[PDB]
Design a protein around this ligand. Sequence first.
Ligand SMILES: [Zn+2]
Ligand SMILES: [Zn+2]
Length: 74
Amino acid sequence: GSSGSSGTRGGDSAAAPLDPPKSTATRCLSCNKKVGVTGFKCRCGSTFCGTHRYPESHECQFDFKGVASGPSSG
Ligand SMILES: [Zn+2]
Ligand SMILES: [Zn+2]
């Protein structure tokens, strides 16, 4: 057996999916990868990694400037 503990309190959390107070973290929205701070915020608010930071890579839910087209992957 071993001893140890880790926890944070406050209003740091910037983006996170609908989850209970049991635990909260920051990960990508497509690869659910630990992005923490390095994460790249998007117009939709969500947080992605340096791989899915761009919109074209991740179907941005937030309607860009309202107008919508929906680019299909040939
Ligand atoms: Zn990602
Ligand atoms: Zn987005």
